[model samples]
Target: AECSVDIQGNDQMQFNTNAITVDKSCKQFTVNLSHPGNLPKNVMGHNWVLSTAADMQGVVTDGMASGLDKDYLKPDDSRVIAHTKLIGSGEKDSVTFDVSKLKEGEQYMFFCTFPGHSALMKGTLTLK
Candidate 1:
């Protein structure tokens, strides 16, 4: 339970969970993302992105410019701490990042990079 997290997205452009807390006992953390909606990725694609809260807007903007082929995320962007590939209906994807990347008390954000999706798909991530 300390090693991974499960999150869901649907056609409504909403994430099932609103916040995530990572325990310090875990050395690595994984995020499993699943899309439950029937729409194809082009219409309702969802992916999880992690970064500092301050970087969210910039990440989203660059991701939009990057287009769907790139999972709506900038390639090799330093601001991105971890991310999963965009997935469509019934599809699943996961990303594993070292827990050390997270610092206690540092503000972190996780959200979908799909254009305009973050407005409803965003959430906070904390290291506890």
Candidate 2:
């Protein structure tokens, strides 16, 4: 089975995937993010942030304060399991993490921390 997933963020403030699964046999996993629109980063930036479902809100909240320069994520936030740099139109970014950090049966989340992108950019992550 595949151990990586590809996702897209567009000018619509949306993510192409709503759910992602990490295969139990995999030692590591990767998330690839890209922007398909032609807008500037400031107007339509996107990033992939991973955390527990419960920590999603906190991550986004603090990320809002961090701004785009920090990729909209709190600097060195422990809640962030893994993340990618912010990308603009025609740009791409990827993040890889050890599968060991993900616990089975726990609800994980992946979303963009752009100012208001989480409203439609979040998705569930699970280990199976």
Candidate 3:
């Protein structure tokens, strides 16, 4: 299956999937995100952000200034491992990254940094 995952976002500002697993046999992983509501990007945008757990806050803090034009992410932030473009209702986005970039014992997070959405729209990724 190539270790692909699909996530959904609604007008309520939540992600359908809460956590994901990286199978040892996969060399890469992909996350597909979709917004199935009617809200516009400026109002209810969503995206997937991947990074170390410790860096999530920093990344989100910096992203707030980047504006939605940059998918609510800072330009070339080294702390971000992979992320998807911000999308509105009826829109979708995805991101893929090499499995090697993640370590076995590391704590990693996947979230949507769309302004104040992180508190309710985040999850964790684990290597298994």
Candidate 4:
């Protein structure tokens, strides 16, 4: 069966959900991201970025230099399995990635790379 998930981010530097699961039977997974706050992208934008928990810091650090125009993520950063575009209030975006990219025993994490937001806007992704 196909698996899909919906998550929301807001200007308060929080995600509506802190964890997600991907069934092994799924060939692919979809993440629908929505920002329900009224802030501007520069002030309170959010995006969903997926990578191994170990790679989170490096990806976020490098992504910082990439700036907001690049969605605050490095161009072609191999560590990022998938991600959505930066969005602000009343906006939404989605990203679909192959489930095969995830390993059974490895831990994954998801977060918004918007500057200081990583401190509060982050969560776990697991394959089960």
lDDT of 4 by residue, 1-128 (tens): 25999999987899999999999999999999999968999999999999999999999999999988898999999999999999999998999999999999999999999999999999999999
Model 4: worst 10 consecutive residues (lDDT sum): 1-10
Once superposed on the true structure, which residue ranges of model 1 sit more than 4 Å away at CA? none
TM-score of each: 0.98, 0.97, 0.96, 0.97
lDDT of each: 0.94, 0.91, 0.91, 0.94
Clashing pairs in 1: none
lDDT for model 3, please. 0.91
The digit string of per-residue lDDT tens for model 1 on 8-122 reads 9999999999999999999999999999979999999999999999999999999999987888999999999999999999999999999999988889999999999999999
Q: For residues 60-89, could you state the per-residue lDDT of candidate 3 as single tens digits? A: 999998987888899999999999899999
The predictions' CA RMSDs to the true structure, in order, are 0.7, 0.9, 1.0, 1.2
Candidate with the greatest TM-score versus the true structure: 1
Question: Relative to the unseen true structure, what is the Cα RMSD of model 4?
Answer: 1.2
Clashing pairs counted in every model: 0, 0, 0, 0
Model 1 lDDT vs. the true structure?
A: 0.94
* Candidate 4 TM-score, true structure as reference: 0.97
Q: Identify the superior model by lDDT, candidate 2 or candidate 4.
A: 4
Better candidate number, 3 or 4, judged by TM-score: 4
